Design a protein around this motif. Structure first.
Motif, PDB file in Angstrom:
ATOM      1  N   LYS A 125      -2.961  -9.866   1.674  1.00 47.36           N
ATOM      2  CA  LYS A 125      -3.514  -8.563   2.136  1.00 47.36           C
ATOM      3  C   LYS A 125      -4.494  -8.799   3.287  1.00 47.36           C
ATOM      4  O   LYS A 125      -5.089  -9.851   3.405  1.00 47.36           O
ATOM      5  N   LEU A 144       0.855  -1.185   0.000  1.00 50.81           N
ATOM      6  CA  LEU A 144       0.000   0.000   0.000  1.00 50.81           C
ATOM      7  C   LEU A 144       0.890   1.234   0.000  1.00 50.81           C
ATOM      8  O   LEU A 144       1.730   1.422   0.859  1.00 50.81           O
ATOM      9  N   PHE A 194     -10.105  -5.586   2.345  1.00 49.41           N
ATOM     10  CA  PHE A 194      -9.402  -4.279   2.189  1.00 49.41           C
ATOM     11  C   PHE A 194      -8.547  -4.311   0.921  1.00 49.41           C
ATOM     12  O   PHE A 194      -8.823  -3.532   0.025  1.00 49.41           O
ATOM     13  N   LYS A 196      -5.596  -3.459   4.782  1.00 52.08           N
ATOM     14  CA  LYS A 196      -4.871  -2.435   3.984  1.00 52.08           C
ATOM     15  C   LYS A 196      -3.366  -2.654   4.142  1.00 52.08           C
ATOM     16  O   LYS A 196      -2.581  -1.732   4.040  1.00 52.08           O
ATOM     17  N   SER A 197      -2.956  -3.869   4.397  1.00 52.05           N
ATOM     18  CA  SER A 197      -1.501  -4.144   4.566  1.00 52.05           C
ATOM     19  C   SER A 197      -1.170  -5.543   4.044  1.00 52.05           C
ATOM     20  O   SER A 197      -1.977  -6.450   4.107  1.00 52.05           O
TER      21      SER A 197
END
Length: 125
Positions: free
Chosen positions: A90, A24, A125, A93-94
């Motif tokens: 994932k 990200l 995410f 968001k990571s």
């Protein structure tokens, strides 16, 4: 997701003897291992995911570790090289990075990283 699990078991060896959380293009989150990845960590993962061409054929390389990468385009991406392995999937968001050696099997780590994610997948995410 591996953030809190990075400073305890998940990284020490709760599945991987090493682990890092990068990805990200917003910033980093938390890493814990004995390998420093070049500053192009989040720029090498987002670009590596272009057409599974560069990662599929030849594979990809990092600070001092690399794999062949079998599948990389759906959602999860646990690559392997025959001895070590790096689970890059994932979650919040990571992209967690289970960096482990041959001591851990490519299945015992993919099973724990599959349940923990199963929790953050409900959202997506």
């Amino acid at each position: 997701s591996w953030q809190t699990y990075v400073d305890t078991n998940l990284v020490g060896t709760g599945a991987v003897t090493q682990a890092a959380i990068l990805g990200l293009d917003g910033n980093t989150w938390a890493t814990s291992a004995g390998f420093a990845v070049t500053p192009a960590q989040g720029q090498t993962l987002a670009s590596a995911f272009n057409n599974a061409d560069p990662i599929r054929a030849s594979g990809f390389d990092l600070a001092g570790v690399h794999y062949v990468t079998l599948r990389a385009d759906d959602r999860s991406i646990y690559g392997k090289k025959g001895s070590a392995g790096v689970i890059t999937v994932k979650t919040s968001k990571s992209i967690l990075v289970g960096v482990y050696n041959e001591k851990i099997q490519p299945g015992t780590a993919a099973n724990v990283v599959e349940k923990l994610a199963d929790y953050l997948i409900g959202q997506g995410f």
